[model samples]
Target chain A: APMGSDPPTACCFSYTARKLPRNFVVDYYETSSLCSQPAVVFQTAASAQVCADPSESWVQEYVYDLELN
Target chain B: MPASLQQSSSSSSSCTEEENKHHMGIDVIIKVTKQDQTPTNDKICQSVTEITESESDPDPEVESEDDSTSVEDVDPPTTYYSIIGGGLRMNFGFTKCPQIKSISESADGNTVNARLSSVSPGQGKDSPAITHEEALAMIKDCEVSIDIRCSEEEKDSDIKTHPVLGSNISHKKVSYEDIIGSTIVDTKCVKNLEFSVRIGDMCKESSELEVKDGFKYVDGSASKGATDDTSLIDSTKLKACV
Candidate 1:
């Protein structure tokens, strides 16, 4: 809102891989066979309205190739 | 006159708008970490909720969605993998898997633990016919594809079920997945996956903060530290002003 001030809010979430698929990559988000890590990094400004977009997200993909000695 | 302030409960219809405010806040710092790979560990990913002086309402409406107690809560971590000869696919299976103990948040080792990344070599002994092509075929099932599994064990032999609500017994391995360039991101582990997490509640730049959300976890990332250091916002009473 143009007249908007701000809110006092701190929220965070995390996950530990209990059991995952054999192969997968990750970003901050997932869609289909889109994003694969090399993950993206995001930083918000100190005081500016966040720009919203349904696209341009963090996506990670799975690569099942590992060197097994 | 003073500026018109808007207030909405987390459970109210206005929750999304309020949540939208959180992503742009300055008081928040979100970072995700990963656990090493293990074969037999059963766990889920979790993140703590720290309400800062500003974002933190005097009394936050502790609804069931975000959780109460201010501790961390976890949905099943997402997994993504592919079978040999098959194209890549994202898995969206969820189960009430056994709780994953956080190395940073765990009370002790006696509790359950989990990892953010792992590779579970498929079952079955040596396959004489297993071809390099099949091995290469499973290349899509690699770790970077968001693969994870869960295994559960009781703290002790005496513990067969939960002391309180005994529901779905037996630990489970749930998986969620997302590919690169996609809109939705997969799960994110917590800060360093080793020690404490920094909580953000209020900020002066509520509109400037960056937020990432999914069916899984949500945390802040300040790759451009203080350079983008947001200021705290003005605090309000529990009441909402229209």
Candidate 2:
């Protein structure tokens, strides 16, 4: 009857067309599976949040880089 | 006594009065020196001296010398800049933000000196913003004076509230308008002004994070879509998954 009792979290309905440089990102977190789009959200130096497609090579690379550090 | 000795004795009384006046002057000097030792009076004297020295030479090195003499425990004045649209706003702090004490321009308006007290953790929603027109005008002719102090740490510890998404997570475009709403000034104009940011009483560290290219990514996002879409998601529906 319903997907689940848990509520849906803020998910990216869309992603930025432009790829952000690694240095611009200060921190990042992954979106919940409950949302339609599986995305990596980046927090920039200015504290602005950007939603990026996780499948993109650059986005995956950024995630990997952040994980190492 | 003899006539010569009598004459000298009268003159001695006259000289005693003169000596009394001289002693009064010396007493006043001693009082002034005593006031100089006091914390409040010391700061007052230093403030006057600093203003005089800055006005006279406007040399950055001389400014650093003034900072050295300042009391370390005393908090610096909070710096604020007025923007074209944003009106007057204050500077914010981040992990990378330097603890700036003051920023002053030369008497000739050709050079600038930004003095830092130390580096430490800081917190704020966003930094101040300045338009291109305001930035150009600031550097054009007149020298500007600004004093900056770090925001209180207690506020930084609080969980920040976000409009669209709750618990400090939300999606937004990296655009000129969005980021500029929270920047010291547009990075492009910031690049034009060449100045020294002297660090004080702190270990040498890396340069401030460059926001010019950071703005590029933000401005580039405008082509894709508006950031308002992220807000469309219901706040009550949002959950802290990760």
Candidate 3:
């Protein structure tokens, strides 16, 4: 049976239209195939999670930079 | 008949016509629920038949008369879409989206009442509608968050105007059955209202790997002697939910 907590994990129905500050992002991960939309969950230094569309250029650059560093 | 009797009869019929006109402005309330659970199926079927009959019997003479006077005054009714789990989707039409003051679950947890704003004018359009299949696919295992807001307000104000959060209601999973039992009541105004249901929680702790899968490993020349602790490496990259 499908069982877990109230809100399921890593699924995004809406995306933030604004871009996230690079300095605020500490780490990020792509949501799995189960998600309806492709998204990059950016973890900020303030412990805030910002979900962004992975197709965006800024998000792609941020992921590349994080992977490099 | 005497003159007084004739006048009285005419006035009575006119009074009935006036009552019909007043009834036209009455607010429309539509309750959408699971088909099997609905008790008024007979009434619904009767209403549908009446609508079909009216549409089929349109008179050209009346249509021409209505086109000149009533057509221009009629505005498109605003539509609200409710996408339920298990492939149930329903829609209702209103003059405008009602201003939501607050939403509260009943003490029995079987019903929810969304109180409309008494002051704000419920004017504006909701976002484009989505299908039940789309909603279910996107929601997957997440709890659906009912987003109630003025269509004209900035999206950023959602945090402050959130019906549940602003009312100090704790976030919990609202089942599909619970939604069917909900109601949106107008306080002192009549307007169309739309409640957008979407998956919640845009962010999560980096340590919550079970939520998602597929991670890209960093390629580097200095990583040849790295230990086999991939989980540790991923943890170092992503911060924990504090």
User: What Cα-based lDDT does every candidate model obtain?
Assistant: 0.21, 0.27, 0.27
The sequence of per-residue lDDT tens digits that candidate 3 reaches over residues A1-69 is: 886444323344334444435544678766656434556767643223445667788878888999999
Ranking, TM-score, top scorer first? 3, 2, 1
Query: Model 2, B12: alpha-carbon shift in Å?
Result: 83
Q: Give me the overall lDDT of model 3.
A: 0.27
Winner by lDDT: 2
Ranking by lDDT: 2, 3, 1
lDDT digits (tens) for residues B1-242 of candidate 3: 34533332232122212211110010111212222222211111101001111112444322334334343322222223221111111222222222222211211111112211111111111112223343333333221122221111111111122222121111222222111111211111112222322121112111111111111112100111212222221111111110
- Global lDDT for candidate 2? 0.27
Cα RMSD of all models vs. native, in order, equals 25.8, 26.0, 24.7
User: TM-scores for chain B, in order?
Assistant: 0.18, 0.17, 0.18
Give per-residue CA lDDT, model 2, range B153-227, as digits (tens).
221111113321111212233221112111222212122211111211111111221111112122112122233
